[PDB]
């Protein structure tokens, strides 16, 4: 009965399907929760699920409560027959039973229609499993043959067969990926007040020092000003490291991968040496500072006394040194860990040994390892991606690897600088100024009439403003063209884009010269009607004798004019931008992350724009669009606009997105190696025959990859 309003960006059918899917998914989730709540502790399904050996909660839901909605190609079961799913159903039945929602569970048994719909649903998984494997294997082979010769030389510089430098140090830190673990910086995020309370080592208290430090060391700490100066220097260096971290890690992501687990070995030192937190420690804080400073010298990724070598070593070990100084802070040692001196020495020794073990072994075949570590998750990745829709999984990985000139769904996320970021009206204004709106999108109907004299007005409603306009010293006396093009502008589309007839007429004049008459109904009416003629006459001259053959009679000339206006008018926005979406993100990667006056990380919900089709240059040039955060998923235009290093970063981001979308994790060094070998020769080298054989490698290297005889002929 048409009470369902269309959600913006979706047709009424799309919104209806979304509502039905939401209802059915909520029902299935509620039934699954109710069923799992009813399982006793002795239930074997629950015993298997909680152990994680096999099965899941949705498996118990399907077995016990409800199988759930069956989907074909990411949508509810289609109408294979004429507007009906099966002959048993009436035509145009969108109910849950007719469209494939299985009310029964596996235990209860499916009804025949539900059985057939479940067969259709399982056919999707069967086809995906059978068909994605070939393309995944081909992708793995291409990646391998691209990276097969990339290796870590004995100076730890990652180089290919031609000794060309791919990375100065493997993983940009020079260490292998087997020994690293996840760790928290614990310096990035803490409120400035909390940071100072946690890492300052306030020695003025004279009671906390007695409680935590031994009685002998308290007098030494207080009396000597050199102790206090060194401690304040340590805290200043830690604050500088905090600033460096906040520069390196926006969005406040404190989970990082580092070679050795500081907290775990601190705990091991506590247990090995029988450390009692209830008692004051015998560890001198200056001894902690000196041990940290000395240990930082023995953790060498880049050896050498050159200033270049010193800077390379500092940059390679910067993050790990920051984390180590954060965890090995004097105040943390005295307050939380309470480590003893001998325990601290043993901990330093273990840190040095484990970090030296974690260093990547020269001679390690890093290229093939990274290619396999990239291709292996592709096997478990779905071939399908199914209201912004972006290609994910194997097809998106293929698009990124080949750098397809025309991606299937090229999108361009947009961030807003000023008040448009927060206010919805200005965000909609930017939306309308970015979305391509030609004349056809706004006019309701257009027609070509015949008006031999303007005052005639063969259309009745136009008499008023027509007799208003032609009663001035105008060109009516001469042969005003009797052919009239009358267009009707749709009020809804008129006000949706905040367009007005003055803007449209200005665009018409700019595009078609001053020799085209445009007359409109200054709104405040009932039909946003616009009248346009093709006035040329002959400037009041003698008739017309022997007119040129290609006169293009005004009726069909008006035909061409109307077609050109309806097709290529570009009233607003930027071309190759089919549709722009607008929403407030709930995920932190698209949220605005700022540093408060307290130093904390807070996320602001600001309107962002996702576009179908990409034009990065003009969108970035556009007013009030954030030039720093705006980016697109396709790589070719990023190469043509922002450069090659921006391509490196954006390609790394796209690969990380397509890999971690399903929740999987792949160590960063493999992604970095792939992006570096693609962005190495200065241009976007594709992982394929054209680009792998375009390198200046050996002919026998190329002849093993997809060309053989051709490469040997060229050689």
């Amino acid at each position: 009965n048409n009470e369902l309003e269309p959600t913006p960006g979706n047709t009424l059918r799309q919104t209806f399907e979304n509502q039905v899917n939401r209802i059915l998914n909520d029902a299935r989730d509620k039934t699954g929760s109710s069923a799992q709540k009813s399982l006793s502790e002795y239930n074997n399904f629950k015993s298997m699920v909680v152990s994680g050996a096999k099965g899941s909660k949705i498996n118990i839901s399907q077995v016990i409560a409800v199988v759930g909605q069956q989907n074909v190609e990411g949508k509810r079961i289609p109408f294979g027959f004429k507007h009906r799913t099966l002959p048993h159903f009436i035509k145009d039945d969108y109910g849950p039973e007719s469209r494939g929602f299985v009310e029964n569970s596996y235990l209860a048994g499916l009804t025949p229609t539900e059985f057939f719909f479940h067969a259709m649903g399982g056919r999707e998984g069967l086809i995906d499993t059978a068909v994605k494997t070939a393309e995944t294997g081909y992708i793995q082979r291409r990646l391998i043959k691209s990276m097969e010769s990339v290796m870590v030389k004995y100076d730890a510089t990652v180089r290919n067969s031609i000794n060309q430098v791919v990375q100065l140090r493997y993983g940009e830190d020079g260490l292998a990926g087997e020994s690293v673990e996840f760790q928290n910086l614990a310096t990035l995020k803490p409120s400035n007040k909390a940071f100072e309370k946690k890492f300052r080592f306030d020695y003025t208290n004279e009671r906390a020092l007695r409680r935590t430090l031994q009685e002998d060391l308290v007098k030494d700490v207080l009396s000597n000003a050199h102790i206090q100066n060194e401690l304040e220097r340590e805290f200043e260096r830690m604050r500088e490291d905090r600033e460096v971290l906040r520069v390196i890690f926006p969005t406040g992501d404190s989970k990082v991968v580092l070679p050795c687990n500081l907290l775990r070995m601190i705990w091991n030192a506590q247990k090995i040496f029988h450390i009692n937190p209830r008692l004051p420690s015998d560890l001198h804080p200056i001894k902690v500072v000196e041990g940290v400073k000395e240990l930082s010298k023995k953790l060498v990724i880049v050896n050498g006394d050159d200033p270049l070598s010193r800077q390379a070593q500092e940059n390679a070990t910067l993050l790990f040194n920051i984390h180590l100084r954060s965890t090995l802070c004097s105040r943390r040692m005295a307050e939380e860990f309470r480590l003893s001196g001998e325990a601290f020495d043993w901990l330093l020794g273990e840190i040095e040994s484990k970090f030296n073990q974690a260093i990547a072994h020269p001679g390690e075949m890093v290229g093939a390892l990274a290619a396999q570590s990239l291709g292996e998750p592709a096997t478990q990745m779905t071939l399908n991606t199914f209201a912004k829709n972006v290609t994910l999984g194997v097809p998106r990985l293929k698009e990124l690897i080949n750098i397809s000139k025309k991606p299937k769904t090229p999108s361009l996320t947009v961030f807003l600088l000023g008040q448009s970021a927060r206010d919805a009206e200005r965000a909609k204004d930017i939306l309308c100024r970015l979305e391509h709106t030609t004349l056809r999108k706004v006019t309701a109907n257009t027609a070509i009439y015949y008006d031999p004299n303007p005052q005639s007005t063969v259309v009745a409603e136009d008499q008023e403003w027509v007799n208003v306009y032609y009663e001035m010293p105008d060109f009516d006396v001469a042969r005003i063209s009797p052919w009239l093009l009358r267009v009707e502008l749709d009020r809804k589309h008129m006000t949706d884009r905040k367009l007005t007839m003055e803007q449209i007429a200005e665009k018409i004049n700019a595009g078609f010269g001053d020799d085209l008459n445009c007359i409109f109904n200054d709104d405040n009416a009932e039909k946003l009607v616009l009248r346009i003629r093709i006035m040329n006459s002959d400037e009041n001259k003698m008739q017309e004798e022997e007119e040129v053959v290609d006169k293009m009679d005004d009726d069909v000339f008006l035909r061409c004019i109307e077609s050109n206006m309806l097709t290529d008018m570009t009233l607003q926005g930027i071309e190759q931008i089919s549709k722009v979406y607008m929403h407030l993100p709930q995920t932190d990667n698209k949220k605005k992350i700022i540093i408060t006056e307290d130093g904390e990380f807070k996320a602001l919900q600001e309107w962002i724009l996702e576009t179908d089709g990409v034009s990065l240059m003009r969108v970035l040039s556009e007013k009030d669009v954030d030039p720093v955060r705006t980016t697109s998923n396709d790589i070719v235009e990023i190469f043509t606009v922002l450069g090659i290093e921006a391509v490196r970063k954006a390609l790394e981001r796209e690969l990380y997105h397509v890999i971690s979308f399903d929740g999987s994790y792949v160590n960063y060094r493999h992604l970095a190696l792939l992006c570096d070998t693609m962005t190495c020769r200065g241009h976007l080298m594709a992982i394929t025959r054209h680009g792998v054989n375009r390198q200046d490698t050996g002919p026998l290297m190329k002849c093993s990859f997809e060309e053989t005889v051709d490469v040997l002929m060229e050689a």
Partner: protein, 244 residues
């Protein structure tokens, strides 16, 4: 088989009762090789001479004698794809064709007759290769299969009363696919034919038994509706390898 097009491989709504949904090979040929359902029958072919002769005898109009001005309201008549003419009273023509096929006087039970009401076309197919399955016939809200038919079939031995006599009695009808498009089926008679909360009242056919949609290998599965469909497919493809 090397083609990556995943659309032809998909199980279609159009395969209901026609091809077994669960049973299909695994590998590069999934979905592209299909085995017949239990009740599925292939049209063998027939010469469309008697149907054309009856249509000529049943009024209608040829294309050579037709007036192009009076063809808009009338319904086109197609026989084996060729256009033979138009008819101004599709309802009675279809009713008489159905009666003749039910009693098997001029039209054999293999021939399929379709009335596409929205598009005003009537298609009659006598071609070979069409896939069809038998279905019970429903008049009003009651089956045409009565107690006496079952009583005579119980004594099928030494009676000379068989499936052919049941079909010739106008009780069961062979309905192919594109005629199944214009049919409305009932799953079981004791549930969907009797009066309840009104869903449909224009039932014209009722399935013999829903288990007939399964193939030869998928029919041996006990309680196949309690299984995940991929596992039914696996068991179907594996039963051919069972040893005995």
């Amino acid at each position: 088989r090397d083609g990556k097009l995943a659309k032809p491989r998909q199980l279609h709504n159009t395969l209901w009762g026609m091809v077994c949904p669960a049973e299909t090979p695994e590998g590069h040929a999934v979905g592209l090789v299909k085995n017949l359902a239990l009740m599925a029958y292939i049209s063998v072919g027939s010469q469309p001479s008697p149907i054309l002769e009856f249509l000529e005898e049943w009024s209608m109009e040829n294309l050579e004698e037709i007036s192009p001005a009076a063809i808009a309201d009338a319904t086109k008549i197609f026989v084996n794809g060729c256009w033979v003419g138009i008819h101004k009273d599709p309802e009675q023509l279809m009713n008489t064709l159905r009666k003749l096929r039910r009693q098997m006087d001029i039209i054999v039970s293999e021939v399929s007759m379709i009335r596409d009401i929205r598009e005003r076309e009537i298609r009659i197919y006598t071609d070979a290769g069409r896939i069809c399955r038998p279905l019970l016939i429903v008049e009003k809200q009651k089956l045409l299969l009565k107690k006496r038919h079952i009583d005579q079939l119980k004594e099928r031995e030494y009676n000379n009363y068989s499936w052919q006599d049941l079909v010739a009695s106008g009780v069961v009808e062979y309905i192919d696919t594109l005629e199944e498009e214009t049919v409305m089926l009932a799953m079981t008679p004791d549930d969907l034919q009797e009066k309840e909360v009104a869903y449909c009242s224009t039932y014209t056919h009722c399935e013999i038994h829903p288990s007939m949609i399964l193939g030869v290998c998928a029919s041996i599965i006990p309680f196949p509706d309690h299984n995940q469909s991929p596992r039914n497919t696996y068991q179907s493809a594996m039963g051919k390898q069972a040893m005995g």
